[PDB]
Amino acid sequence: STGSATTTPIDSLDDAYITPVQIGTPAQTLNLDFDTGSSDLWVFSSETTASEVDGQTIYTPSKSTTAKLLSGATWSISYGDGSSSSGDVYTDTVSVGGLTVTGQAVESAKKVSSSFTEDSTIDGLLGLAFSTLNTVSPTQQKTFFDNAKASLDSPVFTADLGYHAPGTYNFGFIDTTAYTGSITYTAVSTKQGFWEWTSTGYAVGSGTFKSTSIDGIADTGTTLLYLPATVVSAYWAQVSGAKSSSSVGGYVFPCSATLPSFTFGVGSARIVIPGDYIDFGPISTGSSSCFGGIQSSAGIGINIFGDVALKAAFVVFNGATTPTLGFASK
C-alpha cells in the first residue's frame, strides 16, 4: 500500500508546513506538522487546558468508535526551541493520504506551551524520527511510519517541500517524475534516534567547494539551516552589512542586500540552495533589517538541515533495515 498527501506552508515565510491527517471513526481531520526530528504523534484535544487552545481543531476521542484509552500511559516532550507538551495516550485509526494504520498511539495533549497555543494553524505534530525517541511511558510507542512499514510497497517516505508553495509527502513509493537526474544515497546513523548523516562539504555563492565533513540531521520540523560557526561566518562574510545580533538571536542582514546561494555536498553530488530561500524577511514590521535562514549550531550542539536545505531537494527517507537518505535536485 501507498499514501500521498499535500503539505502547505502555514505562512508567507515557510515557517512550518501542515498536512491533513484523518484520526478516528468517523474521520476527524487535523492539520499536523510532519516532523522527522521527533517521534511522537501528539494532538490538541478535548482534554487540553481550555485557556491553552487558541483556534486549533481538537481531536475528540469520545466521538470516535475506534478510540481506546491506553490505560496508565503518559507522555512528556520538550523541543529544542524550548517549547513543550504532555498528557495521556489513546490508540485510534490514523490515515495519511489514503494510507491507514489501526491501533496508532495518538498522544492527547493536556498541557501545551505558549509557542503551540500561538500557532492556530498547527493542530499537532506527526513524529517521523526513529521510535527510540518516543516519550510514551512506561511502554514506548511506535511512530506512524514504523507501524505502516510492513504494509508499504517500499519502506520509504519522501519529502518534497515547496518554496512559498505546496509540496508532497509520499509513503511507500518514489515518484520518478518529482525530481531531475539521479538520487544520491548516503548512510544514516540511528545511534541518537535521528535521520543523522554526513554532508561532504559546502560552497558559498560561486566560490570553490570546500570538502569537509559536516555531521547533521535531516529535520523537517526545524525551519532554518543550523551549521558550524566557521561555515556560517564564511557565508555571512559575503553579505554587505550582515552581522550577528545578540538582541535578535542570530545573523541579520540589510533587507536591500542580495543573498548568495549556498551549496551542500551529498557524496559526490551538490545540492544548491538559492539565495532567495535564505531570506526570512524583516525582523519586525517595517524594519530594514532582515533575518537570515542560515544560523550557527554552536548553542544547540547539533547541525540541522532544516526546511531551508530540505526544500531545495527531493528527499528520500529509506527506513529499510539499513537506513539511508537519498537526495535529488528538482
Q: SS3 breakdown of the chain: % helix, strand, coil, rounded to 5?
A: 10, 45, 45
* Residues 174, 170: Cα–Cα separation, whole Å: 8
Nine-digit cell string for 226: 543550523
3 state DSSP class of 298 = coil
Exposure string for 85-116, b = 16+ CB within 10 A, e = fewer:
bbbbbbbbbbbbbebebeebbbbbbbebbeeb
Contact 42, 34 (CB under 8 A): no
Query: How far, CA to CA in Å, does 301 sit from each of 26, 123, 227?
Result: 43, 29, 10
Instruction: Give CA torsion, residues 120, 123, 129, 131, to 10 deg.
Output: 140
Pairwise CA distance, residues 39 & 156, whole Å:
16
Contact 46, 36 (CB under 8 A): no
Distance of CA 123 to the CA centre of its chain: 15
Catalytically active residues are 35, 199
Distances (CA, A) of 291 to 27, 242, 245, 257, 323: 40, 10, 10, 12, 35
Q: Are strands 294-296 and 225-227 parallel, antiparallel or unpaired?
A: parallel
- Find out whether 83 and 118 touch, Cβ atoms under 8 Å: no
DSSP SS3 for 116: helix
The CA distance from 327 to 271, in Å, is: 8
Give the resolution in Å. 2.0
Residue given cell 524577511 in the structure block = 281
Tally the C-alpha atoms within 13 A of residue 310's C-alpha that lie toward its C-beta.
33
**Are residues 329 and 180 in contact, defined by beta-carbon separation less than 8 angstroms?**
yes
Q: Spell out a b/e string for 291-306, using b for 16 or more CB atoms within 10 Å of the CB, else e.
A: bbbbbbbeeeeebbbb
DSSP state of 122: -
Question: Which cell numbers in the block locate residue 18?
Answer: 501542515
